[PDB]
Design a protein around this ligand. Sequence first.
Ligand SMILES: [Br-]
Ligand SMILES: [Br-]
Ligand SMILES: [Br-]
Ligand SMILES: [Br-]
Length: 233
Amino acid sequence: GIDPFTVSKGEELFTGVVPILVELDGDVNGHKFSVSGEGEGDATYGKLTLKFICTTGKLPVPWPTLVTTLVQCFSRYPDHMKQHDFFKSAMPEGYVQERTIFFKDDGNYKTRAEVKFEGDTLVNRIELKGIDFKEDGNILGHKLEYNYNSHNVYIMADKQKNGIKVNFKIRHNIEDGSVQLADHYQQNTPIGDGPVLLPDNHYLSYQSALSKDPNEKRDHMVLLEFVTAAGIT
Ligand SMILES: [Br-]
Ligand SMILES: [Br-]
Ligand SMILES: [Br-]
Ligand SMILES: [Br-]
């Protein structure tokens, strides 16, 4: 645990608007890149507003393939489900979020992130490793639409890791009208040793919109996103 006093513990840190910083270093089939993002989250409304920039030049993969990787503590948990909010309960010390993302008939991403507070800022620091991609596939060939769909993200307790398991399927729209499936396997573990809320089975409901900043000439993505916990009552 932490200094008891630490003015705000877990949920108390998210009652207002919180600045967010995201830092990602990636390597996909040897194409190395980095991304930074900045914005804010308002968990009362499940609301995220973020702008991401590829800091190394051109992004070697489509932006939509990075949305899931690039802060589930900003989810709106209904009052009646407050006891199932693992993500906020881990704060401020935070949690490790690990994924494997299988792109159907193509490669996989494996990601490891630490999500925690650094002062007033909620920070998501990620490493991403992609292998087994087709150089002419939908990912390295940049054949995905710059858009995003709504999804449910399914959560269960992992009592052995004092954490959670998460799984879900993302369907990316291909430029020919077809669909590129990306199956997500996820686990989160607290960084601290204190108690955390281990949830009953439930899900998060996501809506996401991607756009561009008309005055931004670097390779970038503007993201608006709303996230709401559901599935209990
Ligand atoms: Br793109
Ligand atoms: Br999120
Ligand atoms: Br969109
Ligand atoms: Br469920």
